[PDB]
Amino acid sequence: KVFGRCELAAAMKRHGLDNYRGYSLGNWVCAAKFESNFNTQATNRNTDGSTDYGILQINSRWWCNDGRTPGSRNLCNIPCSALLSSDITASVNCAKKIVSDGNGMNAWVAWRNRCKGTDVQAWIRGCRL
């Protein structure tokens, strides 16, 4: 599924992410956009045999189990496949654990390169929230 911006703002808001660890909402939506283009189904292979999955491009190295990442913690205790679903619960529930792990949203390279320090509010402008 290929989210609306305002639409996705509302679901993440819904599932507890607005202000989660002081990361306001526009961050989450900004991260989402440059990581996956708002597409539940993005997968991108990493040079270290690992794969990034779903809206937030979550890593199979530490967070999910995808069955082909020889070295792998499954810290979110979930198959990577469920991060590609159209319901973002799994994707949201895993990212709360990432943002808490003692690096915050710098865990999302795109967030760090594309959202950090910007007017992240502009990504919820006009959205009925």
List residues binding Na ion (CB under 5 A).
Answer: 65, 72, 74
SS (H, E, C) 62-109: CCCECCCCCCCCCCCCCEHHHHHCCCCHHHHHHHHHHHCCCCHHHHCH
Task: Kindly state the number of chain residues that form the binding site for Cl ion, as judged by CB under 5 A.
Answer: 17
17 is an interface residue for Cl ion by CB under 5 A: no
Angle (CA) 108 112 117, round 5°:
140
Tell me whether residue 66 is one of the annotated catalytic residues.
no
Q: Which is nearer to Na ion, 41 or 65 (CB)?
A: 65
106 is an interface residue for Cl ion by CB under 5 A: no
Q: Which is nearer to Na ion, 18 or 52 (CB)?
A: 52
Distance between CA 88 and CA 92 in Å, rounded? 6
Kindly state the tokens that stand for 70.
Answer: 């020889």
Q: Give the residue carrying structure tokens 């390169």.
A: 113
Please give the residues from 25 up to 84 whose contact with Cl ion meets the rule CB under 5 A: 25-26, 36-37, 39-40, 42, 46, 54-55, 59, 83
39 binds, among Cl ion, Na ion, none (CB under 5 to 8 A by kind): Cl ion
Judge residue 70's burial from the number of C-beta atoms within 10 Å of its C-beta, 0-12 exposed, 13-18 middle, 19 or more buried: exposed
Kindly state the tokens that stand for 19.
Answer: 């202000």
Tell me whether residue 52 is one of the annotated catalytic residues.
yes
Catalytic sites, residue numbers: 35, 52
Interface positions with Cl ion (CB under 5 A):
24-26, 36-37, 39-40, 42, 46, 54-55, 59, 83, 91, 104, 120-121
Residue numbers in the known binding site for substrate are 101
